[PDB]
Design a protein around this nucleic acid. Structure first.
Ligand SMILES: [K+]
Ligand SMILES: [K+]
Ligand SMILES: [Mg+2]
Ligand SMILES: [Mg+2]
Ligand SMILES: [Mg+2]
Ligand SMILES: [Mg+2]
Ligand SMILES: [Mg+2]
Ligand SMILES: [Mg+2]
Ligand SMILES: [Mg+2]
Ligand SMILES: [Mg+2]
Ligand SMILES: [Mg+2]
Ligand code: NA
Ligand code: NA
Lengths: 143, 71, 102, 65, 182, 212, 136, 71, 152
RNA sequence: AUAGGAUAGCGCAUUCGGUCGAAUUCUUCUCUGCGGGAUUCCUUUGUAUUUGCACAAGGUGAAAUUUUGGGCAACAGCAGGUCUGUGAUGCUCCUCAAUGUUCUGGGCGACACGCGCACUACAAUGUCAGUGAGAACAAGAAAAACGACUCGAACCUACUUGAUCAAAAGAGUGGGGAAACCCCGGAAUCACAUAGACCCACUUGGGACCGAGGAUUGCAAUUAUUGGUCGCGCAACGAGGAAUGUCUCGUAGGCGCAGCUCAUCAAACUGUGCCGAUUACGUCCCU
């Protein structure tokens, strides 16, 4: 019938995760083509699972979500992926549901963790000359 | 610290004197008004002037202000 | 159908934008099909060197940067028409290259 | 281990400023001899108003300096 | 369908309260699934007191050069430690950890001669985590016991007030010295 | 192949830097004030800015054709592929390169440093500059070297805006005792025309438009 | 980790190629205690002898020790390639061989004496107790 | 210092079969320090007991194994 | 149950199961069938010169063949150099700092040749290696068997 | 499952960047020239308050105080450094068996030792062996010369062979002037319920020293140029006295990668991204 598709994104450091949310026959969420229960380590699996458990799986009833994450490392990608999933649910309800249930979902997401919907603005601080890093100066000797 | 420099304060006083009728207590409308009656290569200064201009407007409602004539 | 690509390259941002806008306006005057202009990624040539001529003092460095701005405009027009569009005075430091896409 | 509530922070005493001086209201039961008794104490570590302390000895009072 | 988070999907945060009245506002019992949160907890002065207590334990497990920045590793060590704590005590590991934190730091300290001062609740939580992690790290250095075993034994002994705990032994010595500096 | 764009830009910059150095040394006594080149398919057109355009050209353009021969032979330009033009600077007193050459010429003629430096400042400030700052250093009086600066009007030193509003140039003077350095800075008057002045308002100047 | 009861013939030290080999270790890491045999060579020796590397030394019988010594003495006989041996081309004899036990020390002393007799630079550096590679 | 055997004998293996069960907490390090055996042959054997379901596996990992007695 | 299909899901494909579990099941299948060609050099060579010791697993070549088979499934057109970046490690240089070194392309060349002999992979048109139709069927069928917990 | 836990799904089931398919539709992600956006803006039964200038918490918000990090940075100076950057330069020295210039060979690297910086470690928050998932800054080839007749080759890299048997190699076939090839840039810190080996020992820690083989760069490798292989490991080192360096958030620390020097060679520097804390958010005790 109608497609009923929504595309969102989430960011964490240099990682960019793009989630495509589609009405389908059954719920099916994959990150880079990998099912949720096949994501390792279990610590990062639980972090991505937070986008579903804090609102309940009832709102992901018939949603097929495909998340493509590029850039960053394993932890940064996991945070970008969970944010993309959470924003994908909110944008789907924004487009195909009324405001009361969308606001309820958004309030629950923000109550649990701010960065489920709002990207973390932190980035690597540039290195400066005369320093080994952003702030670590060269060792000074006197005698 | 957020001390307004004399350049910001002087421009704010000039704006208030010349365009008192066009200003109110809202920063955003005052910022829009100032961007039309001011030439300045810095948007940071114009934002600061708008902030101090609406501050002077609040003070003027609460009695007189030194440095403002409104003759 | 012949597709011709115009590549505008310079290290001055204002000059490359002025040339691109002039080419775009002239191309629309001859009502030819336009694809773009595409703002390709700008490359920064970076050279970092010591400030002192000798080796004395705190090891301070100068980071010199050169930015290159490139634009591509694809035209569906004959070579005679694309020559007419190109036929105008460009700013100094702007390189415009004409190539026929395969 | 009497529990006391910090009602105000007087200032950062000491040469290095690590120790801070606060006014502590004892959190005693109603009708207790220590009910609403306030003393001045020196506190190590980050402390804020409305924090709670575990006083080992309530007789000692910190110098006002 | 949303349910309360359980740490590693096994341990419940329901009814998790510290016995100490002074430390009630500085030990966080907020429910979480794993001790991993990319939060900016050091932005404000007392913001880290709202960080979940288990995550603060994990942050204390990545200390030396070989340990710095290994937070998934610390989470794995905590996952094993909580299982060992549960077996040792037949109790909720979260409650045992909270009890250990509530007793791992001295209530009174001596500072610069030296004179006795009281310790703020924030420092008490900070020192208890720091001392327990330090004691476990030194106990497991050149020992057959694994790190989860040493950390579990430290936390169990601290939760009971036992003198076998490194943190309690440090606490008793500091409070004794502070008493003599009154 | 065909060199990459990075290599082409580097090559064009190196060509300009060498061209500027050659003309700076060749036209030192003609008030050389700058050079710009425009490249087409037909030819490369180079425009030289100088104060004394008559001496840059010569009789029937003998000097300008000699300079063309120099550039053509060094850079292997073909016949008819290179052209030189000479244009005068509208205001000489607003050009730091022209004034620093004038100061060097006056110093080489045994003129006192105070006299020559103040003469430059008076000429520059008469030209409409917001400010002028010339400095002369090295063996001015005797064996010991000292630096003396002469300034008038406005001058901005910090930020990045002084790269646009301030025109600078430094030359070496070869005297009997040794080497003397002369540096001239001119605070260009912000003029709505871009020839002499950045045409932008000063970065920290705020103007309130008078109501109708 | 074998879950095997300790044999009645278990030896805490096994003598192999005039070397006291610790029987507490796994076979490949007990063979590396023989001079001339490393971790890589010992794994090859155990492979050619049919002994799995999960056994503990000291459980090796006399027959297994003899087979190990035969392989170490003449690795090329048991199809170990030449590129895997110590002396691929002896500078005096010209034959590819593998040195083990006291032969490593003896051949090293002969190499130093040979370089010293020529008065070559590397030999003279050895004579003065100095680093012979680049170093400083 | 410590002398941990790298192979079981009759006595240690029998103690492994009988007394290592009915331990509230079971770990190869704990068994190694009680039976005076190497941790490698303690981690093995504990696996054998778990295979025969004389003990239960509580927390499993690539490096860390935690067991407990069967109720 | 543990192996019951989740609602409307039926069958299985690669990337739907544990990568290691699929690789070990494929390696067991390769060893059990016995038709795969194993070079004699695998008994003495190391996987890469960046490694310090021998691969320490008697069936390491079968595991490597399964791993490269899965890698070719994921990225069609890969070559020996592309596979070398996958199986590289960090080399210990002693007192010098460590650096990343790609794996030796010898074993990767052997592994692809063994798979080509089995008919699972073929030289992709315009460079690289690719999975045959038989190879794709083999990977998916084994993925389903892993999900059913059949193994070998 | 060899013993197999926990972890979402319960009108249309998923997958295939070689399926080296074909067409419509688009900009969510990417690229970017000019803009917008944040300023003490709003609030306070706060502080301080004649006022004013302001401050502190909390809102709003991507961002809440010089947003964050840099660049620039006055006037006076220093007998600071550079005559080893220049066809910058005064005086002076040498100037035809030369202090000019070139060529050959040595040296700048020498080692009882002292000192500053860095790298690697002392191990089980580990070492090996395997497998998984996975970045960002960046670099890449040549002439008024050589061959053909404007083009080719130099530089980088992919694929394949070498390969019916080690690495490192060696060879072909393409591609790339660099958002086009490399490249879907498979970095390793990391992860693994891998049912893997080791088990507290100078030990499978450490990898310094040294021996033989072979390859490569170069006109030339001896004083090992640099990789690769097998040996040596029995060389100390089991956490380091007095003293002392740097650092407040994507920071310290840890981890690599690129550029740069470069025919060959990084424990250096200049950048880049990845994993990511403890503590304080105070004072004038020391400097
Ligand atoms: K001064
Ligand atoms: K070696
Ligand atoms: Mg200024
Ligand atoms: Mg400034
Ligand atoms: Mg790998
Ligand atoms: Mg190491
Ligand atoms: Mg090393
Ligand atoms: Mg390192
Ligand atoms: Mg030297
Ligand atoms: Mg080692
Ligand atoms: Mg250097
Ligand atoms: Na340990
Ligand atoms: Na001189």
């Amino acid at each position: 019938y109608a497609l009923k598709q929504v595309q969102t994104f989430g960011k964490k450091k240099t990682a960019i995760a793009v989630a495509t949310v589609t009405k389908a026959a059954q719920c099916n969420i994959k990150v880079n083509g990998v099912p949720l229960q096949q994501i390792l380590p279990d610590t990062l699996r639980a972090k991505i699972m937070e986008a579903i458990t804090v609102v309940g799986s009832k709102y992901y009833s018939r949603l097929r979500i495909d998340v493509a994450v590029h850039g960053g490392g394993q932890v940064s990608q996991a945070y970008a992926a969970r944010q993309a999933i959470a924003k994908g649910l909110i944008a789907f309800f924004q487009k195909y549901h009324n405001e009361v249930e969308k606001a309820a979902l958004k309030d629950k997401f923000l109550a649990y963790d701010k960065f489920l919907l709002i990207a973390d603005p932190r980035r690597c601080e540039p290195k400066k000359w005369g320093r080994h890093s952003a702030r670590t100066r060269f060792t000074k000797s006197y005698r | 610290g957020k001390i307004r420099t004399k350049t910001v304060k002087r421009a704010s006083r000039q704006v208030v004197e010349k365009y008192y009728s066009k200003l109110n207590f809202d920063f955003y409308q005052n910022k829009r008004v100032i961007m039309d009656v001011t030439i300045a290569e810095s948007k940071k200064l114009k934002n600061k002037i708008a902030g101090y201009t609406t501050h002077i407007m609040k003070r003027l409602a609460r009695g007189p202000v030194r440095g403002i004539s409104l003759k | 159908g012949q597709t011709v690509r115009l590549t505008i390259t310079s290290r001055n941002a204002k000059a490359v934008e002025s040339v691109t806008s002039q080419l775009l306006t002239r191309a629309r005057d001859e009502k030819v099909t336009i694809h773009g202009p595409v703002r390709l990624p700008t490359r920064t040539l970076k050279i970092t060197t010591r400030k002192t001529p000798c080796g004395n003092g705190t090891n301070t460095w100068d980071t010199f940067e050169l930015k290159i701005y490139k634009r591509i405009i694809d035209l569906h027009a004959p070579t005679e028409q694309v020559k007419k569009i190109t036929s105008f005075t460009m700013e100094s430091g702007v390189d415009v290259s004409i190539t026929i896409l395969d | 281990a009497q529990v006391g509530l910090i009602i105000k922070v007087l200032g950062r005493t000491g040469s290095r400023g690590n120790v801070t001086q606060v006014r502590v209201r004892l959190m005693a039961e109603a009708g207790s001899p220590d009910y609403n008794r306030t003393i001045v104490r020196n506190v190590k570590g980050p402390c804020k108003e409305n924090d709670m302390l575990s006083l080992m000895e309530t007789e000692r009072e910190a110098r006002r300096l | 369908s949303s349910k309360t988070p359980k740490l590693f999907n096994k341990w419940s945060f329901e009814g998790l309260e510290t016995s100490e009245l002074a430390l009630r506002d500085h030990i966080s019992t907020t429910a979480a699934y794993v001790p991993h949160t990319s939060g900016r907890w050091q932005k404000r002065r007392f913001y880290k007191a709202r960080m979940p207590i288990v995550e603060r334990l994990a942050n204390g497990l990545m200390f030396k050069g070989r340990g710095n920045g290994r937070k998934l590793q610390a989470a794995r060590l905590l996952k094993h430690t909580l299982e060992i704590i549960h077996l040792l005590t037949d109790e909720n590991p979260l409650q045992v950890v909270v009890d250990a934190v509530s007793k791992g730091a001295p209530r009174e300290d001596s500072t610069r001669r030296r004179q006795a001062v009281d310790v703020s609740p924030m420092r008490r939580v900070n020192e208890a985590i720091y001392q327990m992690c330090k004691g476990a790290r030194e106990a497991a250095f050149r020992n057959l016991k694994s790190m989860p075993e040493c950390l579990a034994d430290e936390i169990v002994n601290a939760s009971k007030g036992s003198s076998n705990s490194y943190a309690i032994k440090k606490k008793d010595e500091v409070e004794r010295v502070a008493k003599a500096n009154r | 192949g065909p060199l990459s764009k990075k290599r082409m830009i580097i090559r064009d910059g190196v060509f300009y830097a060498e061209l500027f150095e050659f003309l700076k040394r060749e036209l030192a006594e003609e008030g050389f004030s700058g050079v710009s080149y425009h490249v087409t398919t037909l030819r490369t057109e180079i425009v030289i800015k100088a104060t004394k355009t008559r001496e840059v050209l010569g009789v029937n353009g003998r000097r300008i054709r000699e300079l063309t021969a120099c550039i053509q032979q060094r850079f292997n330009y073909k016949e008819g592929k290179l052209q030189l033009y000479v244009e005068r600077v509208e205001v000489r007193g607003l050009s730091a390169m022209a004034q620093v050459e004038s100061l060097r010429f006056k110093l080489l003629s045994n003129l006192q440093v105070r006299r020559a430096a103040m003469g430059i400042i008076r000429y520059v400030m008469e030209s409409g500059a917001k400010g002028c700052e010339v400095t002369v250093g090295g063996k001015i009086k005797g064996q010991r070297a000292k630096s003396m600066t002469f300034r008038d009007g406005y001058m901005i030193k910090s930020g990045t805006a002084h790269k646009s509003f301030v025109d600078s140039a430094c030359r070496h003077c070869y005297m009997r005792a040794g080497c003397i350095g002369v540096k001239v800075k001119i605070m260009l008057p912000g003029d709505s025309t871009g020839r002499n002045g950045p045409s932008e308002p000063l970065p920290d100047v705020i103007t309130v438009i008078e109501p109708k | 980790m074998s879950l095997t009861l300790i044999p009645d013939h278990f030896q805490h030290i096994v003598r192999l190629l005039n070397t006291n080999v610790e029987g507490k270790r796994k076979v490949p890491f007990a063979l590396r205690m023989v001079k001339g045999v490393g971790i890589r060579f010992a794994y090859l020796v155990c492979k050619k002898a049919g002994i799995d590397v999960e056994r503990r030394a000291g459980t090796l019988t006399a027959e297994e020790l003899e087979k190990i010594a035969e392989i170490i003495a003449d690795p090329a006989k048991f199809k170990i390639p030449d590129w895997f041996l110590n002396r691929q081309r002896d500078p005096k004899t010209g034959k590819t061989e593998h040195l083990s036990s006291s032969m490593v020390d003896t051949r090293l002393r002969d190499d130093l004496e040979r370089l010293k007799k020529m008065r070559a630079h590397r030999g003279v550096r050895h004579a003065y107790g100095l680093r012979v590679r680049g170093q400083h | 210092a410590l002398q941990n055997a790298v192979m079981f004998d009759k006595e240690t293996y029998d103690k492994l079969r009988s007394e290592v069960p009915k331990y509230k907490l079971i770990t190869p390090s704990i068994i190694s320090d009680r039976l005076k055996i190497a941790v490698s042959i303690a981690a093995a054997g504990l696996k054998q007991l778990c295979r025969e379901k004389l003990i239960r596996l509580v927390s499993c990992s690539s490096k860390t194994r935690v067991y407990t007695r069967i109720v | 149950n543990k192996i019951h299909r989740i609602g409307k899901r039926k069958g299985a494909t690669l990337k739907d199961v544990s990568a290691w579990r699929w690789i070990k099941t494929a390696a067991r299948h390769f060893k059990q069938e016995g038709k795969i060609f194993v070079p004699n050099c695998t008994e003495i060579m190391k996987s890469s010169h960046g490694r310090e010791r021998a691969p320490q697993n008697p069936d390491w070549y079968y595991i490597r063949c399964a791993a490269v088979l899965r890698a070719i499934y994921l990225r069609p057109g890969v070559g020996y150099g592309g596979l070398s970046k996958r199986f590289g490690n960090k080399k210990n240089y002693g007192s010098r700092p460590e650096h990343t070194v790609t794996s030796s392309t010898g074993p990767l060349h052997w592994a692809c040749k063994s798979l080509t002999k089995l008919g699972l992979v073929e030289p992709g048109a315009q460079s690289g290696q690719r999975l045959t139709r038989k190879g794709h069927k083999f990977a998916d069928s084994l993925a389903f068997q892993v999900q059913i917990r059949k193994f070998g």
